[PDB]
From a paper:
To understand the role of the iMet, we made a new [name] expression construct (1–169) that included the iMet and crystallized it in complex with GDP. Crystal structures of GDP-bound [name] (1–169) in two different crystal forms were solved, both diffracting to a resolution of 1.45 Å. From hereon we refer to these two structures as the Mg2+-bound [name]-GDP structure. We observed a minor difference in the switch II conformation in these two crystal forms, suggesting stabilization of the flexible switch II region by different crystal contacts. The structural superposition shows that in the Mg2+-bound [name] (1–169)-GDP structure, the iMet interacts with residues L52, T50 and Q43 (present on β2 and β3 strands) via hydrophobic and van der Waals interaction. A structural superposition of Mg2+-free [name]-GDP with Mg2+-bound [name] GDP structures shows large conformational changes not only in the switch I but also in the interswitch region.
RAS proteins are binary molecular switches that cycle between active guanosine triphosphate (GTP)-bound and inactive guanosine diphosphate (GDP)-bound states. In the active state, RAS proteins interact with a variety of effector proteins, such as RAF kinase, PI3K, and RalGDS, leading to activation of downstream signaling pathways. The role of magnesium as an essential cofactor for small GTPases is well established as it is required for both high-affinity nucleotide binding and GTP hydrolysis. To examine the effect of N-terminal modification on the tertiary structure of [name], we carried out structural studies on [name] constructs containing iMet (unprocessed N-terminus), lacking the iMet (partially processed N-terminus), and [name] lacking the iMet and with N-acetylation of the second amino acid (fully processed N-terminus).
Numbering used by the authors: 0 to 168
Write the structure that this text describes.
Amino acid sequence: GMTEYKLVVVGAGGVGKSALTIQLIQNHFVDEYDPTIEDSYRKQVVIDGETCLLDILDTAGQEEYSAMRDQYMRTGEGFLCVFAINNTKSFEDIHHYREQIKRVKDSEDVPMVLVGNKCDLPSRTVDTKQAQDLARSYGIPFIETSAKTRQGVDDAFYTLVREIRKHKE
Ligand SMILES: Nc1nc2c(ncn2[C@@H]2O[C@H](COP(=O)(O)OP(=O)(O)O)[C@@H](O)[C@H]2O)c(=O)[nH]1
Ligand SMILES: [Mg+2]
Ligand SMILES: [Mg+2]
Ligand SMILES: [Mg+2]
């Protein structure tokens, strides 16, 4: 029936994985959201005229076993790799998440988008050029976002969906 896209949001703690997901799905900016809570968010949306279901796992990197987490990593179709533009360490951590995803999929051709979040903040330490060079090295799109203002939020997730469409054929 209706097309479903299974997405997974990964990245270092505090980059805005939860805020991005909640902004996309519920259209508000959360002030605080327990950093250990991992949950799935679903919504029917229209992307490029195609009505579909998004099924998004907001990961929290906890050690406790979750059969749902395993199912999303195994069957997840695309991944958002998120850092914050005011958090150099979170950008350095990106490679770890990409390498993990490649192992889960046993492939270097996994639908993926690099997300530089918190672009509303002036305290930038990761230049747009640094992130563009990383994305080019991976061969993936790079999108700057603000979960606070909504800038780039739909584009980040929808671009990932478009990458999944490519990978299917
Ligand atoms: N200024 C700003 N703050 C953000 C943005 N996204 C998230 N935050 C804040 O950063 C903190 C961590 O966000 P959160 O979604 O919990 O990060 P997570 O650990 O990756 O899930 C929270 O206090 C959010 O309100 C953003 O785009 N801009
Ligand atoms: Mg979170
Ligand atoms: Mg919206
Ligand atoms: Mg520098």
